[PDB]
Write a protein that binds this ligand. Structure first.
Ligand SMILES: Cc1ncc(COP(=O)(O)O)c(CN[C@H](COP(=O)(O)O)Cc2c[nH]cn2)c1O
Ligand SMILES: Cc1ncc(COP(=O)(O)O)c(CN[C@H](COP(=O)(O)O)Cc2c[nH]cn2)c1O
Lengths: 339, 339
């Protein structure tokens, strides 16, 4: 059959998996943009100059240290495509974390080496140290998804020393806008093998744009340029993204972050008071992890009411946990009341 | 160095390569669209229902036989990602043809098997027959880029019989809007291993949208779904594409094709009269291949005047040839006068 012609790994593959939507870490409200460049008949630039410069300014890096792609999801893939030789090289991640690291590698055909984090979700530096042989890329989400906490800077120094001249360390900063001070963007000067993933999908409130970035040293960006599609970004996206990255746009973004942090603090306080809520974990992001008694029963009940959360009950060490995206005060009340 | 960590194939890799732009087969004039869906904060559907249904209607296929991607360029990559096992399987194309077939395979790490076409750019069926061992995907551009002619249907039947239960045959119909009658979309019923690439980049005049499609049998589309990025299309693109694919939009498209065919016929007639023009090849597309005496001298001279063409002097059997995209009457005159 046609299926018999497909690659084995593709044949046997784990495909990525009135109501309130608090399940995908998206900003709760739509920010409106309108096209300004009516030049759709022509092919766009590979890397739109306006987008790259506005973002370098914002991130505080040089334009030659930025690469724009279709979301950080593409950034994850590109790194594996340029550095990992399928069948020979490996990827290394630390669960429970973002699922696309393993999906991309499994789709491409690269080995996944896993070293679960410690009980407080911090890095198991000795274990990582023990499994670095044959690893080309290490992914670390900080702040982590789904747990919500930052990785100790001291441990990040250790990981970078361990991988020097052996692997690329990628810090996934998809939610870094919520705790700006914690960004590793300033470490690029000290570490050549450091890469950072950014996105406009969360704090920026532009998930539907599919626009992300990779911050790295020129040598790494240059290698990534050789594996990326010729015109990865559409003109309507590059147009709206440069608009969102204008000074006034950066100011509006910061105001959305502020409003989310305030709503997050309210939500955490209110949930601690709840009986079925055994534990609410602190977060430096736009989502909250919480352990419930009979979480599946609660998940279902809310689901049946039109309140959509993200079950994490199957993730390593997250049994009983549900991830709640922070939305509006009205949506927070709905969850509280429903709980 | 960082470079030493990159894959060998990536290290040694061929990276894709007042004035008049007649060099990229883009429609000469911009057709204006405006966003209608202000929902950018949320993630879009993996495969926008409106885009898929409007295109299935247009192409005359079932929605389950369509897959939308970031241009036909992504369609080329996906097929290799799902069917070719790097280091083990091969791809087969027939030069001189579109360059992305070999670039994608070389980037991914898959072998390229080449069987040059015959002197009239038709398929060398005996040669293909001789090199099918270990090939999973065969690409055939029809009408071909850069030559402009259609592949004999009789020979396509032969290729499909040769590959039955051995490989996927992909017909690249990027320029099929110029010769609709010649589409193989109706053969899907007879051949399970047949895949067709479509795009909105040429006749549709929407290259800046980066929107393409893959027509195939449900079983093939289902396999492709397992290797594609979770949200391959942005909301602004899916919005403008469904607009362009509305009945009235299909009517406007056909009017652009008509205007290009008329301008193409004028351009061919006028160039035959020119001294340095040794031969002008017939085309069923929006570009014309022509052999010039001292083509590089002519290419440069025009280039220095602000008239940008596409040199093909390096392609197998195309020495002396330059590809001219059909634009407006004013642009045709510029080339004629300048010649
Ligand atoms: C930790 C982390 N890293 C990267 C991304 C990618 O976002 P882009 O939109 O820029 O590609 C995300 C975002 N991931 C989410 C939400 O988390 P989850 O519920 O899947 O764990 C949305 C998404 C995009 N592709 C798959 N899922 C991120 O959280
Ligand atoms: C024969 C053929 N097949 C596919 C495509 C892809 O178009 P998408 O925009 O839908 O990805 C093209 C278009 N290719 C061109 C122009 O031809 P050339 O001058 O490169 O030979 C533009 C392009 C897009 N990516 C690389 N080049 C096509 O001609």
């Amino acid at each position: 059959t046609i299926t018999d012609l497909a690659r084995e790994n593709v044949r046997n593959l784990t495909p990525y998996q009135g109501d309130v939507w608090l399940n995908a870490n998206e900003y709760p409200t739509a920010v409106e943009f309108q096209l300004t460049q009516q030049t759709l008949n022509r092919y766009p630039e590979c890397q739109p100059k306006a987008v790259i410069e506005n973002y370098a300014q914002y991130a505080g890096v040089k334009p030659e240290q930025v690469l724009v792609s279709r979301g950080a999801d593409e950034g994850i893939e590109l790194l594996i495509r340029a550095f990992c030789e399928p069948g020979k090289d490996a990827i290394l991640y630390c669960p429970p974390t973002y699922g696309m690291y393993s999906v991309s590698a499994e789709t491409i055909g690269v080995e996944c080496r896993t070293v679960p984090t410690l009980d407080n979700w911090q890095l198991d530096l000795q274990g990582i140290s023990d499994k670095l042989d044959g690893v080309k890329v290490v992914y670390v989400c900080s702040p982590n998804n789904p747990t919500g906490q930052l990785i100790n800077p001291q441990d990040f120094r250790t990981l970078l020393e361990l991988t020097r001249g052996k692997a690329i360390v990628v810090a996934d900063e998809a939610y870094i806008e919520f705790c700006p001070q914690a960004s590793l963007a300033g470490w690029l000067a000290e570490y050549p093998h450091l890469a950072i993933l950014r996105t406009l999908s969360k704090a920026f409130a532009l998930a539907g744009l599919r626009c992300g970035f990779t911050l790295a040293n020129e040598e790494v960006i240059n290698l990534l340029m050789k594996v990326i599609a010729p015109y990865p970004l559409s003109t309507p996206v590059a147009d709206i993204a440069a608009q969102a990255l204008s000074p006034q746009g950066i100011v509006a973004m910061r105001e959305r972050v502020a409003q989310i942090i305030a709503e997050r603090e309210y939500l955490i306080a209110a949930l601690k008071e709840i009986p079925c809520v055994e534990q609410v974990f602190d977060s430096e992001t736009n989502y909250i992890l919480a352990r419930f008694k009979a979480s599946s029963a609660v998940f279902k009940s809310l689901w049946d009411q039109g309140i959509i959360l993200r079950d994490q009950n199957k993730q390593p060490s997250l049994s009983g946990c549900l991830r709640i995206t922070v939305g509006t005060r009205e949506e927070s009340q709905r969850v509280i009341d429903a709980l």
